Amino acid sequence: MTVAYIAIGSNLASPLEQVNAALKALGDIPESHILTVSSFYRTPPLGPQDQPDYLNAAVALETSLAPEELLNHTQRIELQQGRVRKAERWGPRTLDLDIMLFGNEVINTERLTVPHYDMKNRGFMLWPLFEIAPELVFPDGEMLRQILHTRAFDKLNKW
Ligand SMILES: Nc1ncnc2c1ncn2[C@@H]1O[C@H](COP(=O)(O)CP(=O)(O)OP(=O)(O)O)[C@@H](O)[C@H]1O
Ligand SMILES: Nc1nc2[nH]cnc2c(=S)[nH]1
Ligand SMILES: [Ca+2]
Ligand SMILES: [Ca+2]
Ligand SMILES: [Ca+2]
């Protein structure tokens, strides 16, 4: 099995309820087990700012699924939690499940790019990741602890 790390976000339809429901759904993904759940953080919106604050979190999920198979399940869960596509880039959503990392794999398919392209620039991804995996090393050898020591990210507040 491989340890995948999934970023969770919600800013619509009661984010705490959406995230708790998503965690239960993540538990039902086949060939997979949740290892660790982060704290929940209240985060200002990235992109357009005319939307509610997000609940952001992270989960470690060990799995024997193929990377795109895991994506099939995360997309399914988003859709089943009423996620509807709107035109607005980075606009509000009931649930976002991004695959941040899939072990040490570097994946570039039509549907999937891992590591997540912007995660090293987002405190709302890196802080919950550090909470659950403080010893993490990226596929390029960069240490999570070193990024968080060196780069300025705003303080992240718990939900
Ligand atoms: N690592 C990854 N995790 C989840 N989806 C990914 C992905 N890499 C590529 N994708 C693709 O990204 C597509 C669009 O997803 P969106 O949720 O609309 C982007 P977003 O999460 O709002 O922005 P962001 O990636 O800047 O955080 C999905 O349909 C999926 O095919
Ligand atoms: N804080 C935050 N802002 C966003 N804008 C679009 N998606 C997001 C998520 S998931 N979190
Ligand atoms: Ca399972
Ligand atoms: Ca996202
Ligand atoms: Ca997404």
Structural domains in the chain, CATH included, are 1-159 (3.30.70.560)
Whether 63 contacts 4, CB under 8 Å? yes
Distance in angstroms (rounded) separating the CA atoms of residues 110 and 157: 35
Residue 11 token pair: 């800013």
Determine the distance separating the centroid of ligand 3 and the alpha carbon of 43, expressed in angstroms: 29
Q: Give the Å distances, CA to CA, from 158 to 32, 34, 77.
A: 27, 21, 24
Is residue 76 part of the annotated active site? The answer reads no
Residue 90 token pair: 């980075």
- Is residue 125 exposed (0-12), middle (13-18) or buried (19+ Cβ within 10 Å)? buried
CA Rg value for the chain? 15
Of 89, 96, 111, 154, which one is the catalytic site residue? 96
Residue with tokens 């709302």: 124
Q: Give the Å distances, CA to CA, from 24 to 27, 67, 108, 119.
A: 5, 20, 29, 24
Q: What are residue 112's phi and psi, to 5 degrees?
A: -145, 125
Which of 12, 42, 46, 89 most suits a substitution to test ligand 2, by most atoms within 8 Å of the C-beta? 46
Q: Give me the amino acid identity at 132.
A: I
CB atoms within 10 A of CB 30: 9
Residue nearest to atom 5 of ligand 2 (CA): 46
Q: How far is CA 97 from the centre of its chain?
A: 5
Nearest atom in ligand 2 to the alpha carbon of residue 44 is 1
Determine the distance separating the centroid of ligand 5 and the alpha carbon of 1, expressed in angstroms: 24
Q: Are strands 96-102 and 32-37 parallel, antiparallel or unpaired?
A: unpaired
ω into 44 cis (within 30 of 0): no
- Is residue 115 exposed (0-12), middle (13-18) or buried (19+ Cβ within 10 Å)? buried
Q: What is the DSSP letter of 30?
A: T
